[PDB]
Design a protein around this ligand. Structure first.
Ligand SMILES: CCCCCCCC/C=C/CCCCCCCC(=O)O[C@H](COC(=O)CCCCCCCCCCCCCCC)COP(=O)([O-])O[C@@H]1[C@H](O)[C@H](O)[C@@H](O)[C@H](O)[C@H]1O
Ligand SMILES: CCCCCCCC/C=C\CCCCCCCC(=O)OC[C@H](COP(=O)(O)OCCN)OC(=O)CCCCCCC/C=C\CCCCCCCC
Ligand SMILES: CC(C)CCC[C@@H](C)[C@H]1CC[C@H]2[C@@H]3CC=C4C[C@@H](O)CC[C@]4(C)[C@H]3CC[C@]12C
Ligand SMILES: CC(C)CCC[C@@H](C)[C@H]1CC[C@H]2[C@@H]3CC=C4C[C@@H](O)CC[C@]4(C)[C@H]3CC[C@]12C
Ligand SMILES: CC(C)CCC[C@@H](C)[C@H]1CC[C@H]2[C@@H]3CC=C4C[C@@H](O)CC[C@]4(C)[C@H]3CC[C@]12C
Ligand SMILES: CC(C)CCC[C@@H](C)[C@H]1CC[C@H]2[C@@H]3CC=C4C[C@@H](O)CC[C@]4(C)[C@H]3CC[C@]12C
Ligand SMILES: CC(C)CCC[C@@H](C)[C@H]1CC[C@H]2[C@@H]3CC=C4C[C@@H](O)CC[C@]4(C)[C@H]3CC[C@]12C
Ligand SMILES: CC(C)CCC[C@@H](C)[C@H]1CC[C@H]2[C@@H]3CC=C4C[C@@H](O)CC[C@]4(C)[C@H]3CC[C@]12C
Ligand SMILES: CC(C)CCC[C@@H](C)[C@H]1CC[C@H]2[C@@H]3CC=C4C[C@@H](O)CC[C@]4(C)[C@H]3CC[C@]12C
Ligand SMILES: CC(C)CCC[C@@H](C)[C@H]1CC[C@H]2[C@@H]3CC=C4C[C@@H](O)CC[C@]4(C)[C@H]3CC[C@]12C
Ligand SMILES: CC(C)CCC[C@@H](C)[C@H]1CC[C@H]2[C@@H]3CC=C4C[C@@H](O)CC[C@]4(C)[C@H]3CC[C@]12C
Ligand SMILES: CC(C)CCC[C@@H](C)[C@H]1CC[C@H]2[C@@H]3CC=C4C[C@@H](O)CC[C@]4(C)[C@H]3CC[C@]12C
Ligand SMILES: CC(C)CCC[C@@H](C)[C@H]1CC[C@H]2[C@@H]3CC=C4C[C@@H](O)CC[C@]4(C)[C@H]3CC[C@]12C
Ligand SMILES: CC(C)CCC[C@@H](C)[C@H]1CC[C@H]2[C@@H]3CC=C4C[C@@H](O)CC[C@]4(C)[C@H]3CC[C@]12C
Ligand SMILES: CC(C)CCC[C@@H](C)[C@H]1CC[C@H]2[C@@H]3CC=C4C[C@@H](O)CC[C@]4(C)[C@H]3CC[C@]12C
Ligand SMILES: CC(C)CCC[C@@H](C)[C@H]1CC[C@H]2[C@@H]3CC=C4C[C@@H](O)CC[C@]4(C)[C@H]3CC[C@]12C
Ligand SMILES: CC(C)CCC[C@@H](C)[C@H]1CC[C@H]2[C@@H]3CC=C4C[C@@H](O)CC[C@]4(C)[C@H]3CC[C@]12C
Ligand SMILES: CC(C)CCC[C@@H](C)[C@H]1CC[C@H]2[C@@H]3CC=C4C[C@@H](O)CC[C@]4(C)[C@H]3CC[C@]12C
Ligand SMILES: CC(C)CCC[C@@H](C)[C@H]1CC[C@H]2[C@@H]3CC=C4C[C@@H](O)CC[C@]4(C)[C@H]3CC[C@]12C
Ligand SMILES: CC(C)CCC[C@@H](C)[C@H]1CC[C@H]2[C@@H]3CC=C4C[C@@H](O)CC[C@]4(C)[C@H]3CC[C@]12C
Ligand SMILES: CC(C)CCC[C@@H](C)[C@H]1CC[C@H]2[C@@H]3CC=C4C[C@@H](O)CC[C@]4(C)[C@H]3CC[C@]12C
Lengths: 541, 121, 540, 121
């Protein structure tokens, strides 16, 4: 509640607000019979002890205490009554006038000495001439004092400190010391040692800090509070709340100057200002919507293709292929159709693992039965010429392929287990990449193992390439080996190109570009494989 | 607080002399007041007086009736203070009570011990 | 260097060191002349007001200047006859008294007032009377009374200032004294009075550079002569802990005002005892012959390879073929290098060789034995129908080449992946305890070695099934009967050893690990290369 | 270091008067001293006057020979420091020089202007 006190107390003191926020106005003032006479400073206390008023004030009250100790001598001195002789008058006029030069910050002083008032008053600093005009103890203080007269004038605020002089029934007299405070400032308007101790910060901190984490509204002096004295080297900094990426952020938006407001601004996704274009990369729908619809359509068509094959058996053309083998190939491809749909969402960890788990099993089920079928053809040919036909339809090929499936399962299990152990230390999965324009995007990193899988598929397919080379004169009824040759070479070339491209230009590619390339490669290899191995089964009879 | 000590016993006639040695053992020397509160409320030949004002150059604060009387000036009040029986008279027959001041005492002038002295003409 | 000068200054003043070692001294013995006029003051010459020893002295000098300002004002009083009446004389000495009770600590003071001495002085604080005798606030060194003995005072300063006169120099001063007994005597660091910043016998000049963060002070750096009193800052003596390194707390020897040693409690770890907790005990009765014996096994195996190189006839071995038995007798060497490697410190290069050797050795030995056992079965199942497709080296070897390719590939992948996280964490050379707070250096488990443990188990399952198949085939030299043992042994012992090694990972000593490794290696491998070889030179 | 402004021109006879004020424009009033160095070093009829004692309770600095001569005064918060030419003499002819004496002025002070006056009998 300390903050609002100043605002509500401004309307009991006309013309004064302009003086605090503009000290120099006094020059043009000819109104206000008497200026401010008493201002409420009790929120921190009656008066700040050990204040931040510099040692100056401490040493001033110390000189006053020494002086009063001096006057606390002749109250009891023997025969020290006299009759106010001229020498005694000189001593009296000197004893406090000396106090002036001992502190650069003491205004006029005086001594009452009621017996003949005999009071003396002095002029300003560095030029002072005495003038004579005809219960409680321990240095009681007082509120700031204003010379009423018929204005306020430049001097403005001075504190009227005083104490008492006891005698041998007190003396009904005191000593007056005045302290100039124009040269001192407020306690940075946020500390706890003066008028505005951790208060008078209208619409800052509590209003701008809780939400704005690390708002830092002060820096060196928050919420310039009253001024009026001067503008010293404390550097009173207003609207200093930066907040970094905080929801309030800089907030250099509106309600500037004394009427501070507009705490909430310049915070969208990253530590920037004035909207959300920075950092986040542009997202399009024309290259992120039709793609998935097309992929789903192709998937559904493949499903219906599997079914129709289930509906055709007696066509001897397929009989050579074998129902089980072709169904396995189609399912392998269907499974291979999930590196794009997975890329359509945010790159989590579960998805970033699902991607490899799908790609590897597909790339092993599809071109792990074509190669074996070519092998079976080659072996049967090389054996028939010498009294032998060992191989047979599904039942041998599938069992042999089970070995490749076992090896792939094993490697994937090892890789998954190893990856979900380092999560305690580092993730190294969901990284951020730049694109030469100070924009960050979230992607999945390279594991240094994918380099190995890329070359593993290449080496494996070399075996199929050699098979293709060997079988070139075998009489075939439906030219199936001729077709599968394309399905092998095409992959050997494309997959290599796509892998190298994806690896080199890895971080320099936005998410949408990655999706485009993935879809391109998938529909340039897998679709060709399905089409080549299937279409020539319902035609060319 | 202080543990005053009164030592003033001994029969004495008029014109004799004796010392009552009020010692402020638990305190310092010329720092407190005296005045020797007495029970006798009707002394026609005046009573004891006070010495020193606060702390300054111990002074004679007699009421002009004890100057030629009991000498409480002491050799130096920055020690045990002796009160002397100048021009002893029969009215001195009573018990003496040393007293202190400087405030900051719940009683501020109470006595802790007592010496009874008998004096005749 | 001021330390050395202070030590020299110690021996130029009789019966003076004991005052700083012990405050009293005169309390038991004070028999000397006017001694102690000046000892060191300050290493940087003097302190006008710098080094800030308590604010009491700040306020003292401030009151001094303030009071002298009064007199400076009473310099050119107009028509000031100054006849020195009772009231005139009273005023000045009243002021002199007044200057006293404004501060806690202060001693006697005096005013000269040379018109006729007119010198007025009083006693210490709380006890003042009147005694008459018959620029820029210059300082002075510590002072002591000289009329007789030394007694209590103990290095009280004699600050004073002067006053000016006009119509020249009045030749008058306002002397004050300050008792410094009740004052903290520096901290022997962070240069102040009497002590510039190191100021003791080898605070760090012998120990700290060896071990940084010595922490000699904590709150009071290597408490110095001191002597004025014992303040509440807890003068810290020999407080330099320094944790590890030779510079330590060093509670060993030379513990006194001269404790220059501070040289101990440094053996391998941040402890004080001799090296023993940091490094577990090593034996030689166990860690020495274990390598000599394995060297002998290796040399015998090499000579046995040669011996087979010298026997090609004796058809008994023809059924196995030189090309294959040689491969086995070589794969064995590779398998024989998990012990010699473990004989040295666990680096990273060695901690990688440990897998590179083991995996290749295995894939060779039980990648050729299994294939031979498969060839026998195939030939048997084929001859019963007119067919003999298989053949010795040239057929088995190329089939084994596939297993070697796969193993090479996996090892390359694993090595590359493990030499990439070294930028962040090493996760290779770790340490563990054994329930008695003992640390030792070992190689940890990669979470991939679990997979390699089960891979060989699955592989040898194929071998055991082969063994189950070939049971009634007529064999000339019972070779399959032999190889069955070589397969089951490594099915069982290998699994047991792997589980034991993995579960008791960190709770096992280094020498204990060496013992277990040697036991396992010589309980399976030797049986393999002795069972497949010995019969070839007997049972003819 | 104050530019003292002397204004004392004018032809005056013996017995006339003139206010030659060395105003301290660059400073404030009664803080310095004067003494008016003059070109003629041989005044047989006594010397120029001076007043004020810097800051301590302004005092009449006449040397017991200028009391019946040029008279000077101030008005507290009055920088104008005039010296009326009481009982003017033929020797008055010279160039007067108000000066500084407060501090950093070992060999007296210095002047910043010269007034050429002429007085006859
Ligand atoms: C996935 C991640 C990386 C992993 C792996 C990396 C991925 C790929 C690896 C990279 C490069 C490798 C290229 C692959 C080339 C295939 C070779 C081939 O086709 O020949 C094979 C040789 O036969 C075998 O020995 C298979 C056993 C190995 C299975 C397990 C391997 C090790 C497991 C555990 C070991 C460690 C514990 C198959 O024989 P074939 O088809 O040529 O015909 C044969 C042949 O004609 C002969 O004549 C034979 O005699 C006759 O019987 C006939 O059937
Ligand atoms: C994406 C990455 C994809 C990369 C996939 C590459 C996998 C490489 C596998 C190598 C191809 C092996 C093909 C093969 O040999 O299978 C046929 C196979 C079966 O045919 P048969 O009728 O028994 O005999 C006919 C031929 N004599 O031929 C054999 O005789 C081999 C014996 C059976 C295979 C071995 C038995 C299983 C091996 C253990 C399984 C798991 C151990 C390995 C796991 C961890 C390995 C790191
Ligand atoms: C190993 C996993 C992860 C992927 C491969 C699974 C394959 C082998 C599965 C998935 C669907 C399966 C087919 C589903 C239905 C039929 C029809 C039936 O009349 C013969 C078996 C057959 C043709 C199955 C053969 C095996 C099959 C192709
Ligand atoms: C038959 C084939 C095609 C199915 C696909 C493989 C399945 C079994 C794989 C693919 C992704 C795998 C998940 C990947 C990541 C995690 C997170 C981990 O903290 C717990 C295991 C869990 C949840 C895995 C369980 C097995 C999993 C679901
Ligand atoms: C469905 C998947 C996950 C099961 C695990 C993979 C392996 C072990 C499975 C997938 C398909 C299976 C084959 C399906 C059909 C045949 C033909 C039959 O006459 C003999 C068994 C045989 C040859 C099966 C052996 C096991 C097999 C190869
Ligand atoms: C050959 C393949 C198909 C089967 C292998 C069996 C799998 C399921 C077993 C073999 C060893 C097992 C691992 C052994 C030890 C650990 C470390 C533990 O802190 C987390 C679980 C984890 C990582 C296990 C996960 C399951 C695991 C990988
Ligand atoms: C399709 C079939 C053959 C595949 C079976 C694979 C199973 C056994 C594998 C795949 C991924 C594996 C998980 C991978 C990661 C984790 C998290 C780890 O902190 C504990 C083990 C745990 C939970 C593993 C348990 C075994 C696991 C679930
Ligand atoms: C990576 C480079 C440096 C070395 C390893 C390359 C390997 C994987 C290459 C080089 C020669 C290749 C072999 C060349 C010829 C044959 C014989 C054929 O009937 C089956 C395939 C097979 C067995 C190839 C498999 C892949 C192969 C072994
Ligand atoms: C530049 C790249 C992307 C183009 C794709 C390469 C295609 C067009 C090439 C690569 C190797 C080629 C094959 C090489 C060998 C044969 C075997 C022959 O009996 C029929 C033609 C056939 C099957 C070729 C057809 C075209 C082919 C498949
Ligand atoms: C053999 C055929 C299939 C190609 C295999 C590609 C894989 C295994 C390898 C071969 C060359 C490799 C690249 C060579 C150089 C660099 C530059 C480096 O700063 C980042 C990795 C990067 C970009 C490598 C990524 C992986 C990479 C593309
Ligand atoms: C449109 C994008 C996705 C590419 C389309 C790829 C597939 C569907 C196309 C491209 C070229 C096509 C082949 C072109 C020529 C022939 C010969 C014909 O007698 C049988 C079909 C067959 C073998 C086609 C099968 C389908 C095919 C492989
Ligand atoms: C795969 C890598 C790591 C190791 C391969 C080691 C094997 C295959 C090597 C090592 C020593 C080699 C032998 C060295 C000498 C001879 C003698 C000669 O008259 C026939 C070949 C023969 C018998 C070699 C066969 C292959 C061999 C056994
Ligand atoms: C033929 C077989 C048995 C020999 C043993 C395999 C050789 C090729 C292996 C064994 C240990 C391997 C080394 C293991 C670790 C390192 C440190 C790395 O920073 C550079 C590669 C380097 C230096 C490897 C190079 C290849 C290496 C020397
Ligand atoms: C010296 C080492 C590192 C070479 C690399 C290891 C493998 C690939 C080597 C070691 C021994 C080699 C075999 C040695 C002898 C033969 C018999 C010959 O009729 C066909 C080639 C064949 C079958 C070689 C193929 C490659 C081979 C298996
Ligand atoms: C199949 C076996 C026999 C050989 C495979 C080829 C090996 C030597 C190649 C294939 C891909 C290569 C890696 C491709 C990319 C990188 C990342 C780079 O920052 C360090 C080198 C490193 C890690 C390469 C090391 C050598 C490497 C692993
Ligand atoms: C078996 C032989 C023929 C090939 C084995 C692959 C070798 C070449 C691979 C395996 C591990 C690789 C090392 C793995 C990590 C690093 C650390 C890096 O800061 C420099 C490159 C360096 C040192 C790699 C160099 C290539 C490397 C040594
Ligand atoms: C999926 C996880 C549990 C791994 C599988 C479990 C292991 C213990 C078992 C289950 C079935 C086993 C297979 C069953 C039968 C055969 C055919 C035989 O001629 C060679 C061994 C081989 C190929 C076995 C290898 C080991 C095997 C794969
Ligand atoms: C106690 C454990 C650790 C010892 C290892 C088990 C050994 C002793 C067992 C396991 C299986 C056993 C073999 C099982 C089958 C046969 C085939 C037969 O024609 C001769 C005996 C022989 C070859 C057995 C000999 C003993 C054997 C090898
Ligand atoms: C028991 C633990 C320590 C493992 C040690 C097992 C060794 C000593 C055992 C395991 C299997 C054993 C063999 C099992 C069967 C036979 C066949 C018999 O006609 C002669 C002995 C012989 C050849 C045995 C020799 C000793 C042998 C190799
Ligand atoms: C039983 C067959 C597969 C032989 C090989 C067994 C291996 C693969 C298995 C069996 C039991 C397994 C251990 C069981 C328990 C623990 C304790 C745990 O805190 C870390 C993993 C660890 C150390 C496992 C590592 C892998 C392990 C040793
Ligand atoms: C001593 C420690 C290191 C264990 C090593 C012992 C090995 C070398 C011993 C133990 C049992 C032994 C076998 C016991 C019985 C026979 C039958 C005999 O007709 C031929 C040798 C053969 C097959 C032995 C070969 C060597 C053998 C395997």
């Amino acid at each position: 509640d300390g903050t609002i006190l100043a605002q509500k107390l401004a309307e009991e003191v006309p013309m004064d607000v302009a003086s605090y926020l503009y000290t120099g106005d006094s020059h043009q003032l000819k109104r206000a019979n008497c200026s401010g006479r008493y201002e409420l400073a009790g929120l921190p206390g009656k008066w700040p002890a050990l204040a931040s008023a510099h040692p100056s004030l401490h040493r001033a009250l110390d000189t006053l205490t020494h002086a009063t100790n001096f006057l606390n001598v002749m109250l009891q001195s023997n025969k020290s009554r006299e009759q106010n002789l001229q020498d005694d008058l000189d001593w009296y006029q000197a004893l406090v006038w000396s106090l002036l030069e001992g502190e650069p910050s003491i205004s006029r002083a005086a001594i009452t000495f009621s017996t003949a008032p005999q009071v003396f008053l002095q002029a300003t600093r560095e030029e002072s001439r005495i003038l004579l005009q005809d219960d409680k103890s321990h240095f009681k203080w007082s509120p700031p004092y204003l010379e009423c007269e018929n204005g306020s004038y430049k001097p403005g605020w001075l504190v009227t400190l005083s104490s008492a002089i006891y005698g041998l029934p007190e003396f009904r007299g005191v000593m007056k010391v005045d302290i100039n405070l124009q040269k001192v400032d407020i306690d940075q308007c946020s500390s706890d040692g003066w008028f505005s101790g951790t208060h008078k910060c209208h619409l800052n901190n509590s209003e701008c800090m809780p939400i704005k984490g690390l708002g830092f509204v002060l820096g060196a002096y928050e919420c310039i509070c009253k001024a009026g004295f001067y503008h010293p080297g404390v550097l009173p900094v207003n609207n200093f709340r930066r907040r970094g990426p905080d929801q309030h952020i800089s907030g250099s938006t509106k309600d500037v100057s004394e009427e501070a407001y507009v705490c909430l601004p310049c915070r969208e996704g990253c530590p920037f200002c004035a909207d959300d274009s920075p950092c986040f990369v542009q997202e399009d729908k024309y290259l992120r919507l039709a793609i998935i619809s097309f992929q789903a359509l192709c998937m559904l068509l493949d499903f219906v293709s599997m079914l129709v094959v289930y509906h055709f058996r007696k066509a001897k053309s397929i009989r050579a292929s074998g129902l089980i083998l072709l169904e396995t190939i189609l399912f392998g491809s269907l499974l291979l159709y999930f590196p794009v749909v997975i890329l359509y969402f945010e790159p989590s960890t579960f998805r970033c693992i699902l991607l490899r788990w799908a790609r590897l099993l597909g790339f092993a089920t599809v071109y792990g039965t074509v190669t074996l079928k070519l092998h079976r053809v080659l072996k049967v040919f090389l054996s028939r010429t010498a009294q032998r036909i060992p191989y047979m339809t599904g039942g041998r090929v599938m069992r042999m392929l089970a070995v490749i499936l076992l090896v792939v399962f094993w490697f994937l299990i090892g890789w998954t287990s190893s990856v979900c152990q380092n999560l305690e230390k580092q993730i190294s999965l969901i990284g951020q990449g730049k694109t030469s324009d100070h924009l960050i995007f979230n992607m999945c990193l390279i594991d240094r193992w994918d380099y190995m899988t890329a070359v593993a598929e290449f080496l494996f397919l070399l075996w199929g390439v050699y098979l293709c080379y060997a079988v070139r004169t075998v009489p075939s009824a439906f030219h199936e080996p001729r077709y599968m040759a394309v399905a092998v070479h095409n992959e050997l070339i494309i997959s290599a190109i796509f892998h190298t491209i994806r690896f080199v230009l890895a971080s320099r590619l936005q998410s949408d570009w990655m999706l485009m390339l993935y879809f391109a490669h998938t529909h340039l290899t897998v679709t060709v494989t399905i089409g080549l191995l299937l279409i020539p089964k319902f035609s060319h009879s | 607080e202080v543990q005053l000590q009164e030592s003033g016993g001994g029969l004495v006639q008029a014109g004799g002399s004796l010392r009552l040695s009020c010692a402020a053992s638990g305190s310092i020397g010329n720092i407190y007041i005296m005045g020797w509160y007495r029970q006798t409320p009707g002394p026609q030949r005046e009573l004891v007086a006070t010495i020193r004002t606060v702390r300054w150059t111990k002074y004679e604060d007699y009421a002009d009736s004890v100057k030629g009387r009991f000498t409480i000036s002491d050799d130096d009040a920055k020690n045990t203070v002796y009160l002397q029986m100048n021009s002893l008279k029969p009215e001195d027959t009573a018990v003496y009570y040393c007293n202190y001041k400087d405030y900051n005492a719940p009683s501020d002038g109470y006595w802790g011990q007592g010496t009874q002295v008998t004096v005749s003409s």
